Each structure stands twice: as structure tokens, then as C-alpha cells.
Design a protein around this ligand. Structure first.
Ligand SMILES: CCCCCCCC/C=C/CCCCCCCC(=O)O[C@@H](COC(=O)CCCCCCCCCCCCCCC)COP(=O)([O-])OCC[N+](C)(C)C
Ligand SMILES: CCCCCCCC/C=C\CCCCCCCC(=O)O[C@@H](COC(=O)CCCCCCCCCCCCCCC)COP(=O)([O-])OCC[N+](C)(C)C
Ligand SMILES: CCCCCCCC/C=C\CCCCCCCC(=O)O[C@@H](COC(=O)CCCCCCCCCCCCCCC)COP(=O)([O-])OCC[N+](C)(C)C
Ligand SMILES: CCCCCCCC/C=C\CCCCCCCC(=O)O[C@@H](COC(=O)CCCCCCCCCCCCCCC)COP(=O)([O-])OCC[N+](C)(C)C
Ligand SMILES: CCCCCCCC/C=C\CCCCCCCC(=O)O[C@@H](COC(=O)CCCCCCCCCCCCCCC)COP(=O)([O-])OCC[N+](C)(C)C
Ligand SMILES: *[C@@H]1O[C@H](CO)[C@@H](O[C@@H]2O[C@H](CO)[C@@H](O[C@@H]3O[C@H](CO)[C@@H](O)[C@H](O[C@@H]4O[C@H](CO)[C@@H](O)[C@H](O)[C@@H]4O)[C@@H]3O)[C@H](O)[C@H]2NC(C)=O)[C@H](O)[C@H]1NC(C)=O
Ligand SMILES: *[C@@H]1O[C@H](CO)[C@@H](O[C@@H]2O[C@H](CO)[C@@H](O)[C@H](O)[C@H]2NC(C)=O)[C@H](O)[C@H]1NC(C)=O
Lengths: 295, 32, 152, 51, 51
């Protein structure tokens, strides 16, 4: 049901009951649909229509499913209804086939979460942090309107969403459903060397590294001038793209479309079985209603 | 595979059971 | 037969014999499918059905192949069977056409590797060189933007 | 971010206030005032767009 | 074919995705700190962006 919007699946079914009711009324209003079903012997006031309300849905559904029915209207006012509902039908099936031939050739997938705010509402996806680390210490100390709510989760579920180390947190996102929070220079190291992980969100805190010196050292000013010289020539982008380059992962592997199994379609087999069970209840419903007329 | 091959093969014998036993020409206007 | 899984090709054919047997039983159980095939002269106890078992497979296969048949059921209990088996049929053919239009464009988008740059991204296809040779010595010494990645 | 610059409270060459502001900025940066200030002025009109 | 070219396309997402576009043209403040970076840069793409 994905290649058409749920607005469209309702608007087809509302037009399927809509045109069915119009074609029933417009055939009774027309004089040309009244004729004799007995052409062998001559007229004996046997002028008779063919359009019931039950037949008009059977022309509505029967033309929508590209199969056709046995009515085949013969007035000009009814053939214009059939001539438009047929043109309505082609541009649904040829739009359903063409859009399903666009989903199966181009997979454009999206993660459920995009930020901490999109993760501030999820309860299926649980957080994580290194216990007694610099990451957990931030959310305990924070006051900004969302991170307290993110700490309201982790303080409640202690020893559940509080990991022991960075190595366990990587092995829990990779196996379980987990949303581990850690430093931004390690995520850019793990993702480049483990091609099935990703980084969602942006920089929350803003730290910074630095060449440490003793208290009142002469080398502080001479390294600061030296770091700013390397940062503008481009050496600290040549160094970071030498070690955080990683193995160079792939970003194009659109495979052959991996043939439709029971996982892709198979809800069709549910509505197939649901239709046959419903038909039995209508059958025993009309088996008794005919006998109630005979009783 | 096995349950659905069991349900259809039940219904396949019942359909032959209706085809043989019903006279279906002019008899039993409301039956079976 | 590639655009549908072999689970699905069996489940269609098992449902093709399945709905055919149900539509045969549910038409005999229904009173509305019993009528006269002789509407010219009046009734002489000529009330007669149309659904054989041979016709019910011919409605099952005949609607599956998008062609239609001559039965066209007229009871409400039988039209719901025909109304669902038709909707079962569209989402098989429009899934077979759409998936076959995905196999034929993926093996048309693909190009074989044609350069070192097209080989600079592949990890399935692995490189090679004679160890301590003149070929390996080039990539150890090289600095041009791709061959370092090929030496990486 | 392509480049990586940074702003800073400028002082004269060899000023006593460099070390006392550096300790003061790092105190404000961890309490969360420099995220309260930036989300007060770069907050803007609060756009709707999403769709 | 119309509905899959709509899906095969991606919007520009980086300087590398902008390093190939010729329909979409670049821009910078002349004699500014932004233009001075690309004149001075040597990293493999920004020279092409300065080209
Ligand atoms: C005669 C009757 C006509 C009725 C009109 C048509 C029907 C109108 C439509 C109705 C349903 C659509 C809107 C409801 C949305 C609710 C969502 C839902 O719960 O769906 C459920 C399934 O849904 C079904 O099982 C549908 C079965 C109905 C069969 C219709 C046959 C009648 C057609 C007669 C043909 C006429 C023949 C001609 C007649 C002359 C979801 O399934 P789930 O198990 O929850 O899986 C989710 C699991 N997960 C959450 C983990 C992901
Ligand atoms: C191309 C062929 C031509 C057009 C034919 C159109 C005909 C009507 C077709 C469809 C109309 C039904 C309304 C569909 C609205 C979408 C609901 C949905 O999103 O999924 C629902 C599926 O669960 C179901 O409801 C199963 C219903 C399948 C269709 C049954 C129609 C009966 C046959 C019609 C025969 C008579 C026709 C009616 C006249 C009497 C809800 O399940 P879910 O898993 O919880 O969804 C979440 C998954 N998601 C997040 C990705 C969404
Ligand atoms: C008169 C007719 C009676 C039946 C005779 C049939 C006649 C012949 C027609 C078709 C026969 C051949 C095709 C089989 C049809 C569907 C079965 C199938 O394979 O689907 C699934 C199995 O389904 C299960 O058994 C487990 C899940 C149950 C879901 C709902 C069952 C309702 C079936 C109807 C009951 C009444 C419904 C409500 C009525 C108002 C396959 O799914 P899976 O591979 O396991 O992996 C996904 C697992 N998941 C689904 C959990 C996500
Ligand atoms: C528990 C919940 C599950 C559901 C409960 C039901 C489950 C089962 C439980 C109980 C059984 C109930 C089944 C309903 C009645 C069936 C019997 C029947 O049709 O015979 C008659 C009833 O006549 C009527 O009362 C009018 C209804 C039929 C005409 C409308 C069809 C269009 C439906 C549109 C479909 C979509 C509707 C809109 C969908 C959004 C009709 O007779 P006839 O053949 O037309 O004329 C010949 C009669 N004569 C010879 C004397 C002249
Ligand atoms: C009444 C009868 C009903 C029948 C329905 C049965 C349905 C189908 C059920 C099952 C299908 C059988 C699966 C095939 C397994 C054999 C595998 C094999 O070796 O390939 C064989 C293929 O040759 C064939 O098998 C073609 C047979 C078509 C099915 C019979 C017609 C259906 C009629 C329906 C009429 C509707 C009736 C309408 C009623 C109103 C031969 O292969 P090979 O060339 O020798 O080897 C080369 C190997 N190589 C190419 C890999 C190199
Ligand atoms: C497609 O995307 C899916 C979404 O995450 C992903 O599904 C998860 O897959 C992992 C494994 O790949 C599932 O982990 C399993 O968890 C069960 C829980 O009972 C375990 O039996 C087992 O974990 C084990 O853990 C051991 C350490 O404790 C370890 O040593 C073992 O080797 C073993 O891994 C399973 O691995 C996880 O539940 C899935 N998430 C779900 C169902 O929500 C798919 O893997 C992914 N597929 C591919 C091909 O990428
Ligand atoms: C990313 O994780 C997935 C899921 O574990 C890996 O894909 C397959 O994983 C299973 C484990 O059950 C292996 O048996 C398969 O061989 C893997 N498929 C392959 C290798 O094509 C995937 O390999 C992981 N990515 C890595 C390790 O880079």
C-alpha cells in the first residue's frame, strides 16, 4: 500500500462508491436503458432495466480491478460515466505500477531519529552513556530544557542504559537497539572503520583539546602561534584525514531488487483470507434470509 | 507450506464431493 | 521467474486452487446462483447452476491471467470471492511488472570497473602487486590522491 | 564546517586579564550560559517550515 | 522513468557534491576572510573550488 498515499486510497474507495451511486441513478433517469430482455418473441410490456444497486457496485469494482463486468451500458448518459471511470482506472493502475517500480529500484532509507529532540520523545529507542565519564557528567550538570529530560531517563534506568565502557557501548548499538552518547572524535573514528554504523545529530557540547603546559610555561605562547600556523596552512586537516580516513567505506551498493518474498507482500494473503471468511458469513446470512422469505 | 497444503487438499476433495453427488441439472434448486 | 520468490510462486498457485475450491462450494451453498438458463419460455422446473468444478478453475486461472471468463457470478456471497481474487490479482501482476522493471534497470545502471578510480572504491574486488617489485615500489612512493588510497 | 576558526576576548600583549578571562569563559561554558546566550540571539523569530 | 529519476537525484549536501556542479555556481565575499581561505588552500577540492 506504500506507492499511493493514504489520502489516495480513501479517495479511490470514496469515488468507487460515488460513481457506483451516480451510474445507478443516471441509468434510471435515462430512457434508453429501458428495453426488453426477451428479443425472441415480440413485446408484451416486458420493458426491463438491468442496473440494480448490486450490479452498479459490481460495475464499479469490476472495472476498477481491470476485469470488466457483464453490464456494458448502452445509453449515452451512462457510457460517459463508463468512459470516464475507465480513464480514471488506467491512471491509477499505471500510477501504482510505476511508483512501485520506483520504490523497488531506489531505496531511500531514513533513521527514526535525527537529533536529541527527536530522541527526547522516543521510548522504544533507549539512551546510553559511559558511567562516571565526562559524557554522563554533562547531563547530570545540564539544565537546558531537554538534557534534564534525557537525564530523567538515565537516572531512572541505572545499570540498564548506563554502559561500563566505550567498547561495550559500540557492541550494544551494533547488536541491540541503542542510542549511545559519546565523544564526537571517536564516532568519526568508529563510523569510518565500521561501515554499518552512523552518526545522527550534531555537536551538543563544545569541548576542545590542547597541548598541556606547566603553570606559567614559556612554551604556551610559542605553541599557540605554531598551532595557528599549522591550522591555516592545512596540516591539521591533512593529519585528521590521514588517521580518521579509515578503510574508506562504500556509499553505493544498490543491489538487484532482492525478489519479493513473504516479508514484502503477504498482507495481500491476509486480505485474501479475510475476504473468503467474510464471504461465508454473507452466504449463511443470505441462506437464512431467502428461507425467511420462504417461511 | 504444510498447513496450507493441508487446507487446500481438504477443500479439493470436498469440491469433488459436491461435483459428484449433486445432480446439478434441474434438481435441488435450494440445497448443498 | 526471478522477480518473485519461490515461496510466492507456490503461494499463488496454492491460492489459485484454494479460492477455486471455495468459490465452487460457496456457489452451491448459496441460493441466488440457482436460476433458469431458459428465460424465453417460462418455468418448467429448469432451475440450474453454472459452476462446475471445471468452470471454477477456469474462473481462477482466467482471472489470474487478466483475461476474464464467461461465468461472472451473481450472488453477493460469490461476488465477494470474485471481488477479492481480483484485488489479489492486480497486486501480483503490478508487483511482477514493477520488480522486473527493477531487475532490468539495476543491471543496466551497472558499469564494470574501468579505471583505478573505479577500483579505488571497490572493496569486493581486491588489488594485487608483485612484492618488492617495481610495481609495488611505485605505490609506496606515490603521492597522487588515489594511489596512496590504493597503497592504504 | 569547512574551516575551524574561533573568536576570543582580545587583550594587549602581555595583559594580566588573559588568564582571568580564560578561567571565566570556561566557567560560563560549562554551566551553560554560553548556550543560553546563543539561543537567545540566534533563536530568531522561530520559523515554522518543517512540512 | 519520471518517478525514479526523481528518486535517483540527491540535493547537494557538501562541498564535494558542489565540486561537480556547474549549473549551481559558487560565491564568496571578494577580498574577505572566506575568499582568502580558498586562495591559500591546497586540499584536493578547494583548489578546484578556487579554479
Ligand atoms: C462487502 C464489504 C465491503 C467493505 C469495503 C472494503 C473494505 C474497507 C477497508 C477497511 C480496512 C481499511 C481501514 C482500516 C484501518 C485500520 C488498520 C488495521 O487495523 O488494519 C489491520 C489489517 O486490516 C485488515 O485486516 C483489513 C481486512 C478487511 C478485508 C476487506 C474485505 C471486504 C472487501 C469486499 C470486496 C467487495 C466485492 C464487491 C461487492 C459487490 C492491520 O493489520 P495488523 O495485524 O495490525 O498488522 C500490523 C502489525 N504491526 C503493527 C506490528 C506493524
Ligand atoms: C492498484 C489497484 C487499484 C486500486 C484498488 C483500490 C481498492 C481499495 C484498496 C485499498 C482500500 C483500503 C484502505 C487503505 C488505506 C491505507 C491503510 C494502511 O496504511 O495500511 C493498513 C493495512 O491494513 C489494512 O487495512 C489492509 C487493507 C488492504 C486493502 C483491503 C481492501 C479490500 C479489497 C478492495 C475491493 C473492493 C474495493 C472497495 C469498494 C467496496 C494498516 O495496516 P498497518 O500495518 O498498521 O499500516 C502501517 C504501515 N505503514 C506505516 C507503512 C503505512
Ligand atoms: C475460509 C478461509 C479460511 C482459511 C483458508 C485459506 C484459503 C486459501 C487462501 C490462502 C492459503 C495460502 C496462503 C496463506 C494465507 C495467509 C497465511 C500466511 O502465509 O501469512 C503469514 C502466516 O500467517 C500465520 O499463520 C501467522 C500470523 C497470523 C496473521 C493473521 C492470521 C489470519 C488468517 C485468516 C483468519 C481469519 C482472518 C479474519 C477474518 C475476519 C506469513 O507470514 P510469515 O511468513 O510467518 O512472516 C511474517 C510474520 N508476521 C505475520 C507475524 C509479521
Ligand atoms: C459482525 C460484523 C460483520 C458484518 C456483518 C455481516 C456478516 C454476516 C451477518 C449477518 C448477515 C448480513 C448480510 C447482509 C445481507 C445479505 C443478504 C442479501 O444481500 O439479500 C438481500 C438483502 O436485502 C437487503 O436488505 C439490502 C442489502 C443488499 C443490497 C445492497 C448491496 C450493495 C452493498 C455494497 C457493498 C459495500 C457497502 C458499503 C461499504 C462501506 C438482497 O436481495 P437481492 O439479491 O439484492 O434482490 C433479490 C431479492 N428478491 C428476489 C426478493 C427480489
Ligand atoms: C489439468 C492439468 C492442470 C496442470 C496445472 C499445473 C500447474 C503447474 C504446477 C507445477 C509446475 C511443474 C514444475 C516444473 C518442475 C520440472 C523442472 C524441469 O526439469 O524443467 C522442465 C520444464 O518443463 C515444465 O515443467 C513445463 C510444465 C508446465 C506445467 C504444465 C502446464 C500447466 C497447465 C495449466 C492449465 C490450466 C487448467 C485450466 C482448467 C480449466 C524441463 O526442463 P529441461 O529443459 O528438460 O531441463 C533443462 C535444465 N535447464 C534449463 C535448467 C538447463
Ligand atoms: C538489519 O537491521 C536490523 C535492525 O537492527 C538488525 O536487527 C538486529 O540484529 C541483531 C543481530 O544482527 C539482533 O541481535 C540478536 O539478539 C538476540 C537477542 O535474543 C541474540 O540471540 C543475538 O545476539 C547475540 O549476542 C551475543 C552477545 O551477547 C553475541 O556474542 C552473539 O554473536 C549474538 O549476536 C542476536 O544477534 C537484534 O535483535 C536485531 N534487532 C531487532 C530484531 O530489533 C539486523 O541484524 C540487520 N541485518 C543486517 C543483515 O544487517
Ligand atoms: C554490519 O552488520 C551486519 C549485520 O550483522 C553485517 O552483515 C552480515 O552479518 C551477518 C551476521 O549474522 C554475517 O553472517 C554476514 O556475512 C554479513 N553480511 C555480509 C558480510 O555481507 C555486516 O557485515 C556489518 N558490516 C561490517 C562488519 O562492516
Amino acid at each position: 500500500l506504500n506507492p499511493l498515499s493514504p489520502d489516495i486510497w480513501m479517495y479511490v474507495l470514496l469515488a468507487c462508491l460515488g460513481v457506483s451511486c451516480v451510474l445507478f441513478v443516471i441509468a434510471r433517469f435515462s430512457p434508453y436503458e429501458w428495453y426488453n430482455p426477451h428479443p425472441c418473441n415480440p413485446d408484451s410490456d416486458v420493458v426491463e432495466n438491468n442496473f440494480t444497486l448490486l450490479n452498479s457496485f459490481w460495475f464499479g469494482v469490476g472495472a476498477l480491478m481491470q476485469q470488466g463486468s457483464e453490464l456494458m451500458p448502452k445509453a449515452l448518459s451512462t457510457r460517459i460515466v463508463g468512459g470516464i471511470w475507465w480513464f480514471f482506472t488506467l491512471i491509477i493502475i499505471s500510477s501504482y505500477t510505476a511508483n512501485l517500480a520506483a520504490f523497488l529500484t531506489v531505496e531511500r532509507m531514513e533513521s527514526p531519529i535525527d537529533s536529541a529532540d527527536d530522541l527526547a520523545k522516543q521510548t522504544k529507542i533507549e539512551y546510553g552513556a559511559v558511567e562516571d565519564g565526562a559524557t554522563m557528567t554533562f547531563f547530570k550538570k545540564s539544565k537546558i530544557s531537554t538534557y534534564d529530560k534525557m537525564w530523567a531517563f538515565m537516572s531512572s534506568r541505572r545499570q540498564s542504559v548506563l554502559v561500563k565502557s566505550n567498547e561495550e557501548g559500540i557492541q550494544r548499538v551494533l547488536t541491540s537497539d541503542y542510542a549511545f552518547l559519546m565523544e564526537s572524535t571517536t564516532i568519526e573514528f568508529v563510523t569510518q572503520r565500521n561501515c554499518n554504523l552512523t552518526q545522527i545529530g550534531g555537536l551538543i557540547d563544545s569541548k576542545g583539546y590542547g597541548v598541556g603546559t606547566p603553570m606559567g610555561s614559556p612554551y604556551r605562547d610559542k605553541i599557540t602561534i605554531a598551532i595557528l600556523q599549522l591550522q591555516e596552512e592545512g596540516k591539521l586537516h591533512m593529519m585528521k584525514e590521514k588517521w580518521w580516513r579509515g578503510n574508506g567505506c562504500p556509499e553505493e551498493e544498490s543491489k538487484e531488487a532482492s525478489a519479493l518474498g513473504v516479508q514484502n507482500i503477504g498482507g495481500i494473503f491476509i486480505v485474501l483470507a479475510a475476504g473468503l471468511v467474510l464471504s461465508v458469513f454473507v452466504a449463511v446470512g443470505e441462506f437464512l434470509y431467502k428461507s425467511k422469505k420462504n417461511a | 507450506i504444510g498447513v496450507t497444503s493441508g487446507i487446500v487438499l481438504v477443500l479439493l476433495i470436498i469440491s469433488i464431493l459436491v461435483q459428484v453427488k449433486q445432480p446439478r441439472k434441474k434438481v435441488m434448486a435450494c440445497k448443498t
